[PDB]
Amino acid sequence: ITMLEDHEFVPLEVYTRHEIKDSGLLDYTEVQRRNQLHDLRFADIDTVIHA
Amino acid sequence: ANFYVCPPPTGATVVQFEQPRRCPTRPEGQNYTEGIAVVFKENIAPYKFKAT
């Protein structure tokens, strides 16, 4: 008679939530972030010209 | 709380002990082949590259 040896079940999953989220071609959050930061980056949103 | 009377037995009924039964044998066991392995999964991740 021999004891059943202890076993450690390491965490394991075929696809993590991060890669599941990244599976989609376009993510609305990042796309909108880039599109709405486009004005702030490639243009001045504070300088005012009056003449 | 019971009592019994056993008459002197005759040769009418004869009994025998069972012969030693053939003990079952251990299975040969799962013939295991060791070796390295690399499990592959379907590439759901897109093909990313830098574009300008």
Closest alpha carbon within chain A to B48: A25
Which residues fall within 8 angstroms of residue A45, CB to CB, at 6 or more apart? Answer: A39
CB A23 to CB B45 under 8 A?
yes
- Residue B11 CA to residue B46 CA, distance in Å, equals 91
Closest alpha carbon within chain B to A13: B41
- Residue A11 CA to residue A17 CA, distance in Å, equals 14
Deposited resolution, Å:
3.0
CB A15 to CB B44 under 8 A?
yes
| Method for this entry | cryo-EM
Q: What is the dihedral of CA A29, A30, A32, A34, to 10 degrees?
A: 160
Sign of CA dihedral A33, A36, A42, A46: negative
Rounded to the nearest angstrom, the gap between the alpha carbon of residue B18 and the centroid of all alpha carbons in its chain is: 26
For residue B34, give Cα distances in angstroms to A7, A33, B31, B37. 19, 51, 10, 9
